[PDB]
Paper text:
The protein [name] (268 amino acids) was identified in a transcriptome study aimed at identifying genes whose expression is enhanced when this organism was grown with CO as the sole carbon and energy source. The biological function of [name] is unknown, and a BLAST database search shows that [name] belongs to the DUF4392 superfamily (after domain of unknown function), the members of which are found in all three domains of life. To gain insights into the biochemical function of [name] and its homologues, we determined the crystal structures of [name] in four different forms; the apo form without a bound metal ion and the Mn2+-, Mg2+- or Ca2+-bound form, revealing that the protein has a highly conserved bi-metal binding pocket. Our analyses strongly support that [name] is a novel Mn2+-dependent phosphatase.
Intriguingly, in the crystals of the apo form of [name], two protein molecules in the asymmetric unit also formed a dimer-like pair, but they were in parallel orientations. The intermolecular interactions are also mostly hydrophobic and bury a surface area of 1,778 Å2 in one subunit. The binding interface involves α2, α8 and α10, whereas that in the metal-bound [name] involves α1, α2 and α10. The N-terminal segment corresponding to α1 in the metal-bound [name] is disordered in both molecules forming the parallel dimer in the apo form. The helices α8 and α10 of one molecule interact withα8’ and α10’ of the other molecule, as if they form a four-helix bundle. Probably, the parallel dimer of [name] is the biological unit in solution and the formation of the antiparallel dimer is likely to be caused by the high concentration of 2-methyl-2,4-pentanediol (16%) contained in the crystallization solution that probably disrupted the native hydrophobic interactions at the dimer interface. The apo-form of [name] exhibited no detectable phosphatase activity.
Residue numbers in the entry:
A (entry chain A): 12 to 270
B (entry chain B): 12 to 239, 242 to 270
Amino acid sequence: NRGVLKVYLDYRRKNFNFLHNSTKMFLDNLERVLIVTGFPIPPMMVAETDGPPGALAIYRAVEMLGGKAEILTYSEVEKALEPFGVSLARTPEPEDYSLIISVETPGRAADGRYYSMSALEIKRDPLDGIFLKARALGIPTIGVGDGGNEIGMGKIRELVVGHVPHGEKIASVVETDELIVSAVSNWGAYGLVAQASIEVGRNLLEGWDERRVIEAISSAGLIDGVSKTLAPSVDGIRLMVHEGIVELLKAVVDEAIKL
Amino acid sequence: NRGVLKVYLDYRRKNFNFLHNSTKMFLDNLERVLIVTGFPIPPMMVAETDGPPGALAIYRAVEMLGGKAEILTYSEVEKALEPFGVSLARTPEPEDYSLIISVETPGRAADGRYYSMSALEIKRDPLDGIFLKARALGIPTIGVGDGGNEIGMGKIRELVVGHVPHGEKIASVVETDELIVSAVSNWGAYGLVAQASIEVGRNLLEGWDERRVIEAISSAGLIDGVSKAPSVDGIRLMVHEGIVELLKAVVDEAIKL
């Protein structure tokens, strides 16, 4: 392997665990959260299955905590999320939110373009603009990504450039206050929810049906961003594996809050 | 064989198996596929049985995967494919398609003409024009051929020119993004569909009756392009059904694994 996660975990400041600060920022700014997600996969430019499940999980947590959330994403993803009854953000402006979060969303590169991990150019209307504005405004932002070309990855751009294939070209320059790097962005989101959970003594993952969420967005047309498999999946990893890690997080969370 | 298959398999770059990248381009551009086929055999100038079956198998795969397929071919081939209810190319313009595929279709040579493997000149309105336009437009193109004079063989012209009889003159200069070379073009097409089946997880060769399709187009008037019973490339019906069954069995195993 030669990905971002590998080197990031080796050379990141270890004063705290990798989710700590994102959790801190998350819990302190729940008033009105804007959650961005959606990653068009070239050449077809159809949104993938990694990101939406994560965004939905964070969405739930926000409201379970008395806050209010909205989702900013592409049309095909809005449709895939239709069955879950999530509030869709219309004409969102950064000043209207206390926190803005990106779950696996394309981030413009140094050349002003958006690239997939294979250096194929993405041609869809971008969603990172609102994040550049937030940073300029001083509005808290958190990004979750697993490759190096996502919103929030500007925070560790030298890492991507120096250890990731086509780093110079695909590494995004879009920074976020806090960044979450994982093997699967959905997991990264669930990690934040799990840590927020033990933090507030509530299991915010309770009732999360991983298999059902993936199968639903898959049915709606959302594709795997890594393989051509027609079966419901995420990043070339089978359903069994995704339900598997969700259960580990649920179980560890449950044990901790029941202490 | 003093053929192109032999040398192509020896010297093509092997970072990936020989079908891999066409399969990739195939699945990545299923929106609306124009499938071109039909190869006139001189001196009679009637289209042969190698090409149409392959096109039909890909045509079906595209539809099964939810895309739209269309066929541009000679009239005798249209009549031959009529009983299978395929949509026929409506004055095609490359811009209308996300992918253009050629299954054993004549490709112009260095001198602007079209040649059979035996070096006899083909005299029939050309069908390679649209692939030339597609390359200039950046529209995905895949070529399937077994001789070196077909649309797509321009990709390995030097190989054909230096290792195939009458190389210089018959070798096609018509290039396609991805080329599939096989002993029989119908088979190269089935290989594409089979590889696509595996990566997608569905047996796209499901229900393909190889003997039926060859007998149907043959009785429709299409001839064997090599030896001219219903056959393809001088190879007996049984052998064709045999290949298809091997591809079906291996696919079946892989998708249930």
